[PDB]
Ligand binder design. Sequence first.
Ligand SMILES: CCCCCCC(CCCCCC)(CO[C@H]1O[C@@H](CO)[C@H](O)[C@@H](O)[C@@H]1O)CO[C@H]1O[C@@H](CO)[C@H](O)[C@@H](O)[C@@H]1O
Ligand SMILES: CCCCCCC(CCCCCC)(CO[C@H]1O[C@@H](CO)[C@H](O)[C@@H](O)[C@@H]1O)CO[C@H]1O[C@@H](CO)[C@H](O)[C@@H](O)[C@@H]1O
Ligand SMILES: OC[C@H]1O[C@@H](O)[C@H](O)[C@@H](O)[C@@H]1O
Ligand SMILES: [Cl-]
Length: 485
Amino acid sequence: SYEGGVTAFVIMTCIVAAMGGLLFGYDLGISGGVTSMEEFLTKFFPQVESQMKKAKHDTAYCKFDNQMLQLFTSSLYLAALVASFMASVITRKHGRKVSMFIGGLAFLIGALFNAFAVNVSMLIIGRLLLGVGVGFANQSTPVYLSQMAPAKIRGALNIGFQMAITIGILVANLINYGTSKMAQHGWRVSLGLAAVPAVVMVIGSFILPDTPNSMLERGKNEEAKQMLKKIRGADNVDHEFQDLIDAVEAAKKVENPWKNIMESKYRPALIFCSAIPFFQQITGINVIMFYAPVLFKTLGFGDDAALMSAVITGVVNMLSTFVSIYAVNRYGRRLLFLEGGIQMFICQLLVGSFIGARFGTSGTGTLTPATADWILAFICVYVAGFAWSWGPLGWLVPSEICPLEIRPAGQAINVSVNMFFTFLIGQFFLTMLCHMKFGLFYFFASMVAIMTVFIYFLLPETKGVPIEEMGRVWKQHWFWKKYIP
Ligand SMILES: CCCCCCC(CCCCCC)(CO[C@H]1O[C@@H](CO)[C@H](O)[C@@H](O)[C@@H]1O)CO[C@H]1O[C@@H](CO)[C@H](O)[C@@H](O)[C@@H]1O
Ligand SMILES: CCCCCCC(CCCCCC)(CO[C@H]1O[C@@H](CO)[C@H](O)[C@@H](O)[C@@H]1O)CO[C@H]1O[C@@H](CO)[C@H](O)[C@@H](O)[C@@H]1O
Ligand SMILES: OC[C@H]1O[C@@H](O)[C@H](O)[C@@H](O)[C@@H]1O
Ligand SMILES: [Cl-]
């Protein structure tokens, strides 16, 4: 019943949001392919590529175990973790669009720092800057886009952002496959192409307006409704406008969500706002996402085949994220948590044992065409199972079970421990693979068993139930009944 359709304002916001999502996915998916390139390894980590062919030909589990090489991947997420708090502050004091702008600018400057890197300190300075971009943009871009979108197609545009991210992953994989055949400086093109959507984002981010919600929260109702009318193209926006003032009056009268978050009425949610992210990262999904090319390279794929296999993981992640829309709205959260968990579990066991039967505990041995094919196939079945379970639900259900009196705290801790464990995966996958050998896949498998047991016994169905009623579904539960008075 909100009047107002598609305007040039929402086209602009959608250009900027698409650029931001593509940037997320691209900077996530480019690092692994570039780490697998022997030009890049020669120029920044020579001690690593010496230990791979003539010297140390078969030592599969530890060829790439170097803390600086993995810092190249992880520093982005370290910086994103810290920059999310900084973006919280700057969105409050100045505005969400300012954080959008700062994130786009960080994307641009860091992409250029990466492309022009003549030493390793430049390299991870650029990565830290891309992380600053992620920290400022993941905050600002989605809720700016949702505020700007007409209520009718709002969900469609948010789903568009969501899949902009995964298609960006696939785009980065493809760019890596392509630039790897450049005779020189292909990794530069790979890391640097991020600068194009980054400057589209910088420009659009600068010219776009403060949202009517923002003007309402800083007391400019007069400007707010005029801007709402101009952004909607409808000649009266009263129904939407006073729902916005209701929302901002409600948000204003909550004192502090951090003291409410740890009162017992909300401690199921708090538990799940801490357990869901950890679990999502201890699945081992970013093993694949960050390090699929170098994993295939340690097992003896060959550069070309490793990059192509990363491309197929990207294709499967994209298609399965497509079906995850239909999946999360046809089936319940418990069903898909359980199904995806057992799928990932079977695949992790199988992959770990193929690798163990070919290389043992000493890292010496040969892959076979059939075992290489099976390892890739079950990696992909694994990421497909993740892509319609712990992937989307790992953000969906923490927001779902969080009333507005607790939602800022809930999403703060959600994103921060998710980012911290993302960082740990990126910083320690290769050294864990060295110390645990093929047993690391068994470790990830047993932790997925643990998290699925956790979901089966502790999280009740939250699909289709309203926020104001989650309380009841929480004390119908045999265990959480302990916490609601
Ligand atoms: C800590 C790091 C630096 C922060 C700089 C913030 C930036 C420029 C951002 C870049 C330009 C925009 C992409 C926002 O500047 C603009 O922000 C707009 C909100 O979006 C306001 O509508 C506008 O009035 C303001 O000038 C300038 O700060 C201003 O913030 C105002 C309060 O927001 C202050 O009243 C003002 O003393 C201050 O000088
Ligand atoms: C380098 C980032 C890679 C992706 C990481 C997950 C990420 C991106 C930001 C992560 C936080 C960074 C500090 C994509 O979001 C999800 O989109 C789903 C769509 O089906 C996918 O299935 C799922 O795998 C993916 O995690 C989560 O989305 C963020 O932005 C909003 C989107 O609208 C969400 O409203 C918000 O709360 C969430 O914070
Ligand atoms: O597709 C891979 C991505 O899936 C998302 O659900 C996770 O939040 C990210 O950490 C991961 O990189
Ligand atoms: Cl704004």
